[PDB]
Predict the structure.
Amino acid sequence: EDPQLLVRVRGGQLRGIRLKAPGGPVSAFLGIPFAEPPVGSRRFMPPEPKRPWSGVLDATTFQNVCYQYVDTLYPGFEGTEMWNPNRELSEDCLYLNVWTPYPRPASPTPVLIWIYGGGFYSGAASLDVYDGRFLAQVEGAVLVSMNYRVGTFGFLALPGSREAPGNVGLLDQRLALQWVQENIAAFGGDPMSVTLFGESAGAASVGMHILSLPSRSLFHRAVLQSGTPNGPWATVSAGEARRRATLLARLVGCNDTELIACLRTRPAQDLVDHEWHVLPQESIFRFSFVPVVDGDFLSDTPEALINTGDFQDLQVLVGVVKDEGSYFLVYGVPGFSKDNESLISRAQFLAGVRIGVPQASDLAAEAVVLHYTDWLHPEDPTHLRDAMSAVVGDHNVVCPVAQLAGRLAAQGARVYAYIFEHRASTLTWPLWMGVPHGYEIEFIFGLPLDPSLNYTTEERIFAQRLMKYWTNFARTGDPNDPRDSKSPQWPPYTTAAQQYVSLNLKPLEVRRGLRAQTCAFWNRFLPKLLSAT
Amino acid sequence: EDPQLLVRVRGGQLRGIRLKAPGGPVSAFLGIPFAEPPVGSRRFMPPEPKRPWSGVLDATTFQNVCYQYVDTLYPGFEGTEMWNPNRELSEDCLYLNVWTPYPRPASPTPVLIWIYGGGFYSGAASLDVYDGRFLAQVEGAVLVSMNYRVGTFGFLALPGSREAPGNVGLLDQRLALQWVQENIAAFGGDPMSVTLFGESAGAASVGMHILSLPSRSLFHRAVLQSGTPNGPWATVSAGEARRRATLLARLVGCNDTELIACLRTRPAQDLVDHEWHVLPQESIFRFSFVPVVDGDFLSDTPEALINTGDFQDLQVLVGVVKDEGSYFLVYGVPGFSKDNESLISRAQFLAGVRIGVPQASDLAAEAVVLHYTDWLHPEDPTHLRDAMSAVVGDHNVVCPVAQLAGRLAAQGARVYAYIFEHRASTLTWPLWMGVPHGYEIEFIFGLPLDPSLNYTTEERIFAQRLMKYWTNFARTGDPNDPRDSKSPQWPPYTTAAQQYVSLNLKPLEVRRGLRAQTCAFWNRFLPKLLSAT
Amino acid sequence: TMCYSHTTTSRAILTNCGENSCYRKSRRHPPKMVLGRGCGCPPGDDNLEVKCCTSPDKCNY
Amino acid sequence: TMCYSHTTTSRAILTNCGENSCYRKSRRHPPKMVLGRGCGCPPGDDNLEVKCCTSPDKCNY
Ligand SMILES: *[C@@H]1O[C@H](CO)[C@@H](O)[C@H](O)[C@H]1NC(C)=O
Ligand SMILES: *[C@@H]1O[C@H](CO)[C@@H](O)[C@H](O)[C@H]1NC(C)=O
């Protein structure tokens, strides 16, 4: 063992490994610990940095996967399983990985930190989809990816208590941000070019980061793929968080510190086993433990912050996949199945609305049906099916996206929006689901670039272009090539014209107003109705 | 679901399952919980009974396996792996199983409770070898087998502390004894005929039981296969136990209750990872956490108790396998390997003695070499190899066995001794290991009786006879058939004549004095020398 | 009979349950999350449905 | 390269380590108990030897 995969980092030396990309060698440093193992009486507490080690730290592979729940809804089904952890589960899981081209350039390079999604109850950078291998070799970028604590462990909170402050899951990732701001340079990583991007719950964290100053200053640009800090699922009141924790605590078998005390004596398996029960109303796309408004990390609700923060100095990329809400219908919305067209009746569509929009009381539910029913064809199963998926996508992702984008463009931030409309030729889900939640990552990362992987030429040339967009943004802010460019230039989402493009095998096609009408309902009306009921 | 596998037990109803033996149906009730899951803040504490359940308890299968260490010395090697747990590891592991013939007889039947061995750091009744299937169907006996807590969990002690009293591993098994004394009847089980038998560390527990009154009264007869409560490995001083626990505690990352407190916050994986390090001197057949003389369960050392307890009313079966010590040589005694003859030199034999007899200081070590070296052939590798194995077998098992047997026969107890000398035709270990530790269980249980299993006719007819011996003892006390008998009657080990038989394919052959000479050394001399050095 | 086995932290393994019933423990109300499958047929509560089958293989899907 | 992988609580699984070194973490002094094998080659301490190999398969036996 002795090439140039040896690096001194502020805490010791590490030996990486040379991974071969389809286009050549890559320098991967998998496994770098960045915090003291949060086990024993350090669970539920904020991360603490990694004390320096002696000698050379092996870094030839991926570490643990933060203890979590494994979705086993579809045994053996690629679509579902491709998201399951691929390493042993352990609380001793906080480690970040780094990727650099072979050999690491003398010239400082833009850094891309990727935060995994997983509805705040799952996820791991260890996953194949998140393979920085290509984005580094081909584009010549330096990628990074931490493992934040998720679930009970990552977000249980008894606000106003030093034992379980909550939001610690976010704190871990913040730490990884710092480790970069004081180490990435040693990989030829430009400590300025940091561009943190994310999907779903991860994408929500990014947003969560540009809202808390302490975090803010650790990165420069930001990307949000299908998720927002301001949605109805990524935040909970200091009171509700405090409600679930206590409930779980009682469920298990357990005076704040005392409550926590007992919790720390309780088995990870035990805790995981019981997290899906603190959920109040039957619903979908509604997770039990997510960031809480502690009035410390998030001083006030994401909405207020978004509503007033200065953003003129921030470049942002925000987007949505065509069919967002489809994915979650199979988790308990009557009629739906991945094993059939899922042709629903107006009978079931009614229950569908009750579940999907679970916080809305009767009258509001009426407001939803009105808006989504086609009165000239109120019982057409097809329309009803699609409309059902539509209520979930809009309610959770698209509309809140359009909103963040709106409020952000006003406060001077450079915003670019898009809607990825390409269904991969390798999807496993039925045709009726369209381009589901998370099925773009496959491309953003460059997976199609690996000739062993099955895909299509079009898709390959496609993935390449997408890669360019991301990197270009990370390298400058404008996701467009210079004079040498596919002339259909990507227009910055301006509040007034509301333009944005479409990502698919065909060239950039601009459009105006992202769901203008439906969102006006959701973002504008619905709230008021809710306050009134 | 509805036959006669439904039983009301003092805590609720249970539904068993009909398992088919080679000779017909069997009633197996796998899984019966007999104590509140000792997790969270109940770890290191004594067992607590199972609160009654409502409805019918499923009992068609084996439960968890108490968290423990998996020996991976020989990946894929049958000999080694056949002892590894065969169910998920969990602290929620205290469950006993029951076996009865199909259908359960109206006539009360002798009960055989089997305590698994595993050097107090491993084991599970869930293992195939411990399949009560045959012993019940063919012999018409009612077998039972609990899962006691082993390892850190089962025996960590800070004597004179209510948080971790120690010996709790034994306490669990005691509980299972009671559950029998107040439930087994419902399986057609004679609450009098209880005959607890065991191997190695388990066999030591049995002994441990006939020494503590509270336990004693829960059974009538007793069998000890290759292990004793009085050996140098099954007990520790209240001080040494107190030493290791504190050491481990520090190893992990941890004021008695406070010490425990931290321990309870620490991960099973974490604890298992660190138990082999509290071991003081490099040695073999020396385990880190075993029963401790607390002066509560074991009021004084096993020796004193054995030395004075009244035993005239106890029938006992005690025995040894031919080559005991061989098994452990491969765990770090220079020269030895299962992949070769392990022809050792007088050079290494010397180190061999130092390890095997680790508590003995120099002079005593000299005493051992003298005694085991053949001065007319002091360097013959063969003799030296065998002699090396001999020091371990005698020091640990045989001699202490001969001793218990001796002291017991004097105090009026009916004692029968034996030496199982049959090497199975299916052994995987080399020829030089002989009939190693634990390689008789295979037969006692009747496994050869299953025609799918590979063995030899001789071995089959052999296993049948052995089964008879055990059961006969369990059913009366004399391991011999009535008038219809293979006339070579088994003579009760009398102190004076010291007779005992040999178990192998040939008929009972009686012999006098079990290692009379060598043991006199060990049991008699060695102690004194040690006290003097 | 071949069924699937797993906890809330395990992948779906296939374990021969012999001649016995095997389950599927799932959450009763949406989201109807799967909380594990195994051999035998255990009692559930209002919090979780437990479907039990007997034939054929993978019936506890 | 095919090597064995396991903790102190796992069975010996075979995991393709690709083009990398794989280990064997064992206790230094008798009893020389095996405390786990895996890919990569980590630093041990006086408490435990760590043998690392590169070829062939199952070399970290
Ligand atoms: C589709 O499959 C699901 C689950 O098996 C079922 O509830 C539904 O009735 C099926 N048919 C349609 C048209 O969705
Ligand atoms: C047997 O194998 C062991 C382990 O490989 C080795 O130490 C010893 O030298 C070998 N030869 C003999 C004669 O034991």
